[PDB]
Scaffold this active site. Structure first.
Site, short mmCIF file in Angstrom:
data_model
loop_
_atom_site.label_atom_id
_atom_site.label_comp_id
_atom_site.label_asym_id
_atom_site.label_seq_id
_atom_site.Cartn_x
_atom_site.Cartn_y
_atom_site.Cartn_z
N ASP B 93 -10.86 19.02 7.43
CA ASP B 93 -10.62 20.17 7.19
C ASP B 93 -11.46 21.07 7.15
OD1 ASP B 93 -8.90 19.94 4.07
OD2 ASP B 93 -10.54 20.54 4.64
N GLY B 95 -15.09 20.33 6.89
CA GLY B 95 -15.82 20.00 7.00
C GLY B 95 -17.56 19.89 6.54
#
Lengths: 166, 164, 164, 171
Positions: B93, B95
């Site tokens: 999401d 990262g």
């Protein structure tokens, strides 16, 4: 070099047995939550498959230990098992030394119930008394690999359980 | 009080996609060994299924990290120096954890370092990070199942579901 | 394993620790410092060093080892982002483990990152790594004391000695 | 957070550390000892104590973290870093900065007993026995402090003040 010798338990036989064990667990803890603790690393495949057939409210966590010579804890659990039903999942139990220490460690958390579930059991190789409540198979082969279980970090990816020899 | 709303990805859709990713991986590293590192905890189911479709020589290990930068709780034990590495995650999401893990593993001098995520919520990014292998891009909603929890619950569902 | 000759006396260690502390105090006058001790040996030097530093100090520990690649066993808990960091070690020889640890920390974006070692063996370097604060540089290959062990023994000696 | 008064000076701390070391020495005369310091606050005290012990000493560290609410009523903690050294059949002294409720150290005590040590004793710099929620009497104690917030000599207040060479109360 190490090479595969024979298939000991096929992919289908494994899935039939996982289903059988999940059903027994579901019956033994019917209507109750269960916390499943997988002993890393080798049990992760068995655990992944097993929990997908258990329909109870399930919490999962992992534990890591390494023994020498008692036993050293590398990664302890994060979840709460106090007053909970706990099933500790293993790939194989032979000497039982590590798991025996994990048993005493988990008992310190005061769980309601603490049971051991192993895919493979070698009771004849025990060095301490540790009886698993759930056992997939009792297999005699000396070096076993596959379905999460390695030989020198190799073969965990096999979808069946095999023996290896030199 | 959380309840399942709808099935987002069925058990069959998951196994179809897992086979596809495995085949991609097998082609990309044909004839070579691969080291698969699963980011605990939620990726273990995906990882278990994925590696069973990869016939290359595979080594597997696990890493644990958390936000406070990212804190490393459990580093890898295996050697990845000069090896092909595929880091497996459930969802990417923001990262951030993964970007940090990328820098972390690059310090080990692997031959190749790729990221494989079952799910991607690209709208959630906090840093530029593109996974080489992505099972599905999904809406930014709360999901559970197939290893993924909501407050430790639902990891045992064999499908992925939304919750409310 | 028997103790042979005292290489650095308790008094010499304490005089040197005070010197390094004064140096650190002037290098970071008016500022906070985070001191990170590399376990296990450095804990004695770190305990003594920080007690002579008047600055506001935060301490944390890190544990890392070789794979025989540096493995991170215990990461830091405190925030060093935007902070003055001094990594404390007992001995720097290869610098390998500390160079790795240097890149790791840099991933946290500190304001400054310096290295402080009781003993330095630059002739043993396998990577470039210069310590800003160095207590002593001796050639003796086997030493124990003041936190430094031989097979886990002798860390409790208040002096540094050679062993046979 | 402000420093009130010095409760125990650098010199006073070192005099009691010396006395504790002498006690430990006579209790384990002729024997190896394994000292386990509970991170993080005990590291200064441990560094000082072991340097006054003539016995063959092995040192290691343990680190635990609370599970939240439960830990404050049961002492249940998670082991973040377990010990590496062998203590089976060994003389073990666990070193702490402070013992208050004693719940966590009682838990750690059970963990250590699982390794079957020959002896297992507890050594704390500071004690607050009137704050106990479980039976746990330290064999070696530096000082009893009247429940305040205190800092220094390895002990922090929000990660601050561990570097003070003395123990002080903080407002």
């Amino acid at each position: 070099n190490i090479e595969i010798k024979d298939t000991l338990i096929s992919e289908e036989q494994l899935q039939e047995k996982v289903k059988e064990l999940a059903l027994q667990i579901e019956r033994d803890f019917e209507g109750e939550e269960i916390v499943v603790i997988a002993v890393l690393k080798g049990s992760f495949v068995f655990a992944a498959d097993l929990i997908r057939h258990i329909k109870n409210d399930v919490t999962i966590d992992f534990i890591s230990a390494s023994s020498y010579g008692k036993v050293k804890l590398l990664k302890d659990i994060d979840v709460n098992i106090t007053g909970k039903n706990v099933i500790v999942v293993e790939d194989i139990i032979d000497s039982g030394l590590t798991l025996h220490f994990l048993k005493d460690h988990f008992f310190m958390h005061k769980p309601k119930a603490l049971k051991f579930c192993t895919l493979l059991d070698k009771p004849e190789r025990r060095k301490v008394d540790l009886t698993a409540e759930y056992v997939g198979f009792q297999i005699p082969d000396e070096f076993i690999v596959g379905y999460g279980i390695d030989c020198a970090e190799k073969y965990r990816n096999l979808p069946f359980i095999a023996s290896v020899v030199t």
